[PDB]
Design a protein around this nucleic acid. Structure first.
Length: 180
DNA sequence: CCCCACCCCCTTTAGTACTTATGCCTGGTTATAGATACATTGAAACCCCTTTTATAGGCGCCTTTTTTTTTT
């Protein structure tokens, strides 16, 4: 294909192994918002790497927004370090990436309804609901959002390799339905 | 002094008409069992809260601009 999808977002979970007083975290950490009435967790953001963590009373958290596996682990470590610095027996445990999202640009337009009619068992296209075509790939198990513009969204991957393999697999069919 | 006649009685049983109690059946409302109106406390079942990064239509709602109609 000659193109390599760009990783745009990585979601990871981390068990800090120790109960937390969310009310206290929200009070001593900067850039933290806590509104239990709507979500039972403290939302905290940091600038390097630019990410957002969801911290729970159970001591477990979700780190989002990271653009690489390293930034994800690194950011996760900083959040844990803050929880500690606040006064908890937090530890960096069970780090695990749960989802990777990537995007592409094949540069050419795509006749989506032709692609949907051709691959009916994998794609759901109804512009009324959503402008992009939803392609549910089997191997690897990656969901793609194909747009008329040639823009491609790939998600559902746990290894960055799946995004790459998903894109290579779809390129031929994308090319086949190129508007030209 | 004797004979005959008249008066007074008790004997018990058969008749059908009339009165009283029992069985009959009949018009209210009261006392029973269960469900209904429904209302009870009990519980489970439900949506709700922390965000990200990109794609791109439709969606509703804001203040400022231009056009049309009315009045003087």
């Amino acid at each position: 294909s000659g193109i390599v999808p760009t990783l745009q977002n990585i979601v990871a979970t981390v068990t800090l192994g120790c109960r937390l007083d969310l009310k206290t975290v929200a009070l001593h950490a900067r850039n933290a918002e806590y509104n239990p009435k709507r979500f039972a967790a403290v939302i905290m953001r940091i600038r390097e790497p630019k990410t957002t963590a969801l911290i729970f009373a159970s001591g477990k958290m979700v780190v989002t927004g990271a653009k690489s596996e390293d930034d994800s682990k690194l950011a996760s470590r900083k959040y844990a370090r803050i929880i500690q610095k606040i006064g908890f027996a937090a530890k960096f445990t069970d780090f695990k990436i749960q989802n990777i999202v990537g995007s592409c640009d094949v540069k050419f337009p795509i006749r989506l309804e032709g692609l949907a009619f051709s691959h009916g068992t994998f794609s759901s296209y109804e512009p009324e609901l959503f402008p992009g075509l939803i392609y549910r790939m089997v191997k690897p198990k990656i969901v793609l959002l194909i747009f008329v513009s040639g823009k491609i969204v790939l998600t559902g991957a746990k290894q960055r390799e799946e995004i790459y393999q998903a894109f290579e697999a779809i390129y031929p069919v994308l090319s086949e339905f190129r508007k030209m």
